[PDB]
Paper text:
Here, we use biochemical, biophysical and structural analyses to show how a bacteriocin exploits TolC, a major outer-membrane antibiotic efflux channel in Gram-negative bacteria, to transport itself across the outer membrane of target cells. Klebicin C (KlebC), a rRNase toxin produced by Klebsiella pneumoniae, binds TolC of a related species (K. quasipneumoniae) with high affinity through an N-terminal, elongated helical hairpin domain common amongst bacteriocins. TolC is one of the most prevalent drug efflux channels in bacteria and is frequently associated with multidrug resistance. Our results indicate that TolC, in addition to its known role in antibiotic export, can function as a protein import channel for bacteriocins.
Crystallisation screens were focused solely on KlebC51-254 since this construct retained TolC-binding activity (similar to KlebC1-271) whilst removing the putative disordered region at the N-terminus. Crystals of selenomethionine-labelled KlebC51-254 were obtained in the P3221 space group. The resulting structure, solved by single-wavelength anomalous diffraction to a resolution of 1.9 Å, revealed a helical hairpin spanning 150 Å. Modelled density spanned Lys62 to Leu255, with residues 64–131 forming helix 1 of the hairpin and helix 2 containing residues 145–248. The lack of density for residues 51–61 suggest that the disorder predicted for the first 50 residues may extend further into the molecule. We explored this possibility with heteronuclear NMR experiments and found that indeed the first 60 residues of KlebC are disordered in solution. In the crystal structure of the KlebC51-254 isolated helical hairpin, residues Asp137 to Gln144 comprise the linker sequence between helix 1 and helix 2. Using disulphide-by-design, two interhelical disulphide bonds were engineered (L86C, L198C and A107C, Y177C) to lock the helical hairpin in the conformation observed in the crystal structure. In their reduced forms, both L86C, L198C KlebC1-254 and A107C, Y177C KlebC1-254 bound TolC, but in their oxidised states neither protein could bind TolC. These experiments indicate that TolC binding requires the helical hairpin to undergo a gross conformational change from that observed in the crystal structure.
Residue numbers in the entry: 62 to 255
Write the structure that this text describes.
Amino acid sequence: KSLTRLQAESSAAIHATAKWTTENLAKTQAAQAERAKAAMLSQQAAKAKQAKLTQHLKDVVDRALQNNKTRPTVIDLAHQNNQQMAAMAEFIGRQKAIEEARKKAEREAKRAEEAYQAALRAQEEEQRKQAEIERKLQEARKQEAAAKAKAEADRIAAEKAEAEARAKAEAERRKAEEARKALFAKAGIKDTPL
């Protein structure tokens, strides 16, 4: 094969690889946009869960403040009677039990708050990765355009070298035939009808 045809095969193979690279990045972009959308969905669910468990904590706090209204009066501590002691002991038991339930509602609200912050960070990270893939995909498209333009220019150069090779061989063949026939014609030996 001619050097121009061999050069056109080399650049066509490089353009085929540039196409594969761009296509791989385009599929990566589409799969990464789906992961970002999945992370937005998971973040909206953690946001809802945080609001729900915060409301539950608020409801347990209101149960405490309602029970606190029932606090009995025990001021003569040296002369407490059995009914006043039972009233105070039962009030303290109810306040301690509500406090255990409030501590648990608060532990759960805090975990849900932390899970909402983690899902916000995960959404941010999937969007960061998506924007980086998009920058690489733009890079892939620019390299592919350059490879396409080069493969095309090499193919046209190969075609031009063959058109020129053919024109030159025809021009040399006609020049030799005319040179031979001019010797006869210049000596006055002329052509005649068939």
